[PDB]
Symmetry: C3
Subunit: 336 residues, 3 copies
């Protein structure tokens, strides 16, 4: 492309929405390449992650853990204005696994409190990708403190299955999975700290055991269950984007399946089909497409069941509709 | 199909066999869809898992760990009669990852000791799938007490490679891998209990470390060696089904290979080929197809060698036949 | 082929080079099948793996960790002369995952100090494969002491993508990743031992936690950084072979991508494309192909960031050339 051409492309600002929801977008690109603008303010803040009042000094892109999903199409440019308020105490930056060059952008976006920066990159590869903060020397600490999210770079013509047939979803959810490593005192009680840096030494010791104290979705145990369960209806097509910036996970829609799963998260890699449990390595995002056939409650979990039911990696889906006795039926209900 | 159409389908009662063997079946479906009937009695029993006399309070479908492999064909119906003896102490149920609806069937099959239930579901997706108990509130505990197994839903036309060429096996084996979390006393000695519930609190603490004390095949260290080593002969085609309902595994046939491996366990997903070590995420089953070319003993392991040789994840294959010097030969035997 | 036919085949002696470099070879095979000859002397030796001076009694093929990459073409024969010097104290052998029979060669190459052996096998399957020592009863200990490496069996027609188009690399690097389990004293300080045998009991204890103290590339923290960082240029095509003989890893080229990744390491299995982070299960080798588009420093890591930045699994690439502002540009540098 020429220099003037890039400068002449339309610029479009988008209003982000907090996970698990996703901002307005079209599956098939509308018009030619655009420079899609996003702005995110970094917020260091204490959040409670379990039912025992356990605290973590989160480092949250846009104030949420995970950071929000940004959606663009292949060959659009993503132009992000990143802000680090003077009220914060640490330097931060951002690495887009979707980008090319300067460590994904980390080398060009190091901002101290009181500073901002604007990074632009061409989304040349289609798929869902992880993005995360990565200050040299303290990379895992920022990432396991919740400073990561994902973006989706849709093919300009939308999604397709391995045979080239269109796959159009009715709704999309973004489930960011987070491994936390919270220090405990000799009595086994989780410790609280006045400032983020105060917990650094204690936190790294726990990180080295490679064993998280919590593994959660949307920043807390149960954040996506109960009255916050995701929803769908029989017949509805749903895309579930899942990311884990630091550790492996194995998603499974209990009661359902992954009809088409881009396990590696890259759309040019044909999707696996009829999946029970898929695998997303730490440092990546993946996406699963499913058409609901049965109403009721479903569980969506990291299928190491200890991580899901003891550590927190479990969400729910409430589905409306009519039951299908052909697919499943209780011939004889539990009885003496 | 309507309830009437289903009621008219032929029915076939299958008699299950203990792993690693698989009940009689035909790779290519014989006739149209039918309701395949199975029965399994749940047995809470003590099992010894290592040569130090270590005990586990197993919760075993059909009395074995793993539960038996159930085989049907795509679009047949699987009708399971599940029984929970009055002699047992806990409520149990069953979730088939192969099924669609009510958490895989667990929501319709919760049975207290003294009860039974009959669940029918349509096997709409081809492949190997995990099945496991999942009582609300105590899911991982039952699964890591051995209450899990798998089923195989064969394509009606049998197996095929990525280009459609038929793949017909001479023998099939089912290796169920189990991660156990046995509590120890302050002297590093494994503890024993007189009841399942008695070990609950202690076990959950070990489960949370995400570090199993034992990782075994067919319920115990060395279970599939010696009197129980699997067999084959040079030239024979063997399908090795492998499942792990809670934790990741990486199977590898030492001395052999995975000629065709449906690593995700789903038959509509083309198999990987010429594999040395494949990967099966916790919560799934996979299947490898191999034609033996060399006689002798083979070791089949989870290739995290510590898990295989320190923790117990190792099985043996004794293969008969003529040695092939073209493939491998000792030009010079170990010598001065 | 008969013994006579093989004996008539041409023979080529190859000089091995130390990782991460690879001995000279041709991507497209030169002529017909050949007996490719390699010689490796095993050296039990003390090595330092970090800046603090932590010692490990390595068991090293060719004196390095990982052992060197051997390259042949499909259907060539690999003839290895393996020597166990009388200065060593343990018995050693070798299992080539690329071979067929006798536990990969392990059952035919057990040599005590002062002995040697020559093993020949036909490289029937294309791909990168792990090779490692495996003495009955002491398997994981030799492997996690560094006694493993990899080989590459190139298709006779060189590499191609999943659609048949040729993929020709300009450079190739072999990154061997090693999980180490070093004992610590009551002060949390790593222990040193006079003889390798002295460390066995303490080491096995650490091995059983399934938590390595160090995870490194080319035998040491920072081994592939600074003056030893890998190098490339904008426009250059690089193949990165990565192996892990005992534990899972998830490689990621920070700032770049895996344009084509044979994640399972087998060339007849179509490669995934546009990868951010790929996955190689313990007990296997994988390979990624990338054409650099941006100059500057890149980090190549196991993307569980704790393993990368706390445990040692991070390498660097220095890349020469012109920055591409179309791909990425800082619209606004960090500022107030
Ligand atoms: O930016 N490091 O993955
Ligand atoms: O039924 N939970 O895997
Ligand atoms: O030779 N054991 O993987
Ligand atoms: Cu940060
Ligand atoms: Cu990254
Ligand atoms: Cu149960
Ligand atoms: Cu399940
Ligand atoms: Cu050795
Ligand atoms: Cu091996």
């Amino acid at each position: 492309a020429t220099a003037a051409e890039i400068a002449a492309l339309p610029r479009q600002k988008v209003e982000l929405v907090d996970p698990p929801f996703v901002h307005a977008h079209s599956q098939v690109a509308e018009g030619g390449p655009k420079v899609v603008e996003f702005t995110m303010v970094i917020e260091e803040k204490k959040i409670v992650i379990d039912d025992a009042g356990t605290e973590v000094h989160a480092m949250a892109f846009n104030g949420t853990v995970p950071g929000p999903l940004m959606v663009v199409h292949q060959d659009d440019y993503l132009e992000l204005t990143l802000i680090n308020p003077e009220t914060n105490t640490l330097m931060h930056n951002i690495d887009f696994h979707a980008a090319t060059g300067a460590l994904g952008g980390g080398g060009l976006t190091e901002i101290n409190p009181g500073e901002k920066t604007i990074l632009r990159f061409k989304a040349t590869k289609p798929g869902v990708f992880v993005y995360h903060c990565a200050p040299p020397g303290m990379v895992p600490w920022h990432v396991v403190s919740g400073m990561n999210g994902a973006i989706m770079v849709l093919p300009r013509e939308g999604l397709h299955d391995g045979k080239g047939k269109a796959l159009t979803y009715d709704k999309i959810y973004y489930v960011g999975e987070q491994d936390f490593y919270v220090p405990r005192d000799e009595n086994g009680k989780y410790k609280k700290y006045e400032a983020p840096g105060d917990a650094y030494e204690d936190t790294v010791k726990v990180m080295r055991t490679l064993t998280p104290t919590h593994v959660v979705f949307n920043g807390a145990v149960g954040a996506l269950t109960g009255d916050k369960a995701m929803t769908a209806a029989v017949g509805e097509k749903v895309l579930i984007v899942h990311s884990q910036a630091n550790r492996d996970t194995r998603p499974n829609l209990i009661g359902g399946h992954g009809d088409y799963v881009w396990a590696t998260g890259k759309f040019n890699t044909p999707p696996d089909v009829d999946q029970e449990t898929w695998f997303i390595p730490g440092g990546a995002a993946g996406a699963a497409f499913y058409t609901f056939q049965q109403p009721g409650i479903y569980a969506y979990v990291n299928h190491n069941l200890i991580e899901a039911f003891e550590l927190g990696a479990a969400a729910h889906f409430k589905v409306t509709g009519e039951w299908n006795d052909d697919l499943m039926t209780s011939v004889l209900a539990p009885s003496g």
